[PDB]
Structure formats: structure tokens, C-alpha cells
Amino acid sequence: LPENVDWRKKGAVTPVRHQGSCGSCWAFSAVATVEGINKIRTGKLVELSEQELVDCERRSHGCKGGYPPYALEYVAKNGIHLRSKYPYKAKQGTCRAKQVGGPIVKTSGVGRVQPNNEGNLLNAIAKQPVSVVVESKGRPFQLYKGGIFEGPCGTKVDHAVTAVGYGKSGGKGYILIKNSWGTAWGEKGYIRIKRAPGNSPGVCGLYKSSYYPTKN
Numbered sequence: 001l002p003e004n005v006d007w008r009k010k011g012a013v014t015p016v017r018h019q020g021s022c023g024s025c026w027a028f029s030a031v032a033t034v035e036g037i038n039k040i041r042t043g044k045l046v047e048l049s050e051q052e053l054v055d056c057e058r059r060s061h062g063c064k065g066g067y068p069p070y071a072l073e074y075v076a077k078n079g080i081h082l083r084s085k086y087p088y089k090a091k092q093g094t095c096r097a098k099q100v101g102g103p104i105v106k107t108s109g110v111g112r113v114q115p116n117n118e119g120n121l122l123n124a125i126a127k128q129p130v131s132v133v134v135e136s137k138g139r140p141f142q143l144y145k146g147g148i149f150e151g152p153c154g155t156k157v158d159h160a161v162t163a164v165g166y167g168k169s170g171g172k173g174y175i176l177i178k179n180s181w182g183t184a185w186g187e188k189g190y191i192r193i194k195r196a197p198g199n200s201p202g203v204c205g206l207y208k209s210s211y212y213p214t215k216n
């Protein structure tokens, strides 16, 4: 695979956002992967609506969490609106998907990374942004303000974020994660999580559950 990939270098990653007052990480992560395969297949970076998935993705639970593959299923069946035509309110509303103008971004299906294995994950990352899970409940994670993150954390994953790159940095393997906690957190909104090698739940269960949208 390439030894280092950064989708931000590619123009495939939109600015860091903030969830505000809502458990919508599932939606923000599915959004970010969909922006990325979007820019990769079409050349156009656009920002898409997290609020469409909070209000319309009925299998997820709004502002009380959700599941990145369901969201990704949602986009494959229904496509998904411009963040500007269906703006983010940080609470669960009724689904307005029908009433919103602008172009729909559409995908065709969902890719499941075979979990618990480093190279499977990077093979996916080396092709596009991937939705992954992490255990975020640990103080070290919530107070993370930069460096290669090795824990401590457990594998009780509770938070969906987006793998937007991976690489080696003054010799450690990491994965480059876009969080949705604002640019105040971590390295201006990103985290570099230590790569466990081969077959592993990953640092902080980083390998336990990886999905991406398929398109074009």
C-alpha cells in the first residue's frame, strides 16, 4: 500500500465541525466518508448534511447515537442533501429530506472492512475516508490535545469518527482521524491514533467496526 496517505492533501476532507449538543457522531462520520468518496469520484468537494441522517435515518437514534453503516445505507438508498440546503441544528427533528432543494449526493452501497486487522483497514484508507469506531469515554481521549495517541483506553468503542489518512511519524504507525468535537480538541480537531499491527481490535478498538460508502 502507500506508506503514508492523507486525504486532506487530496482535497477530499472538509473543515472540522462540531456536533454541539447532540450524540450525532455516527452521522458526522458517515457524512465525512461521503464528502470524501464524492470528491474522489467527481472532483468536487462538497459539504453534506448530518441533520438529514439525524432526522431521517430511522434505525439510528437521533441525538442519542446511531450506527455508521445504517447511515451509509441511508445514502445508498436515498442520497443526501447539501449541508446548506438541510442545515445542522444539533437536535432531532422531523425528516425534511423531501422538501429540501439542491442536488442529492448518491452512492450505490456500503463496504465493510474485515475488522480487527491492520492491513485490511489501511487497504481501505488507502482508497478513501473510512468511518471507524473508537472508545472515547476515557479521560485521556476527552482531554487529548495532541501527539500520537496510545491510550490508555479500552476497546469498548462508543464514538464514530473518520479515518482520513494513515502514515509513520518520527517512526510510529498511526491513523489520522477527523473528530467532530471542534478544532479546539486534539490537533486542531484531528487525532493520530497508534496503529496496532496485524490482527488486533486496534488501539482503543480502532479496528473493531469500519465502513465506507461505495460510489461511481
Ligand SMILES: [Hg+2]
Pocket (backbone or CB within 6 Å): 023, 024, 025, 026, 158, 159, 160
Ligand atoms: Hg459519539
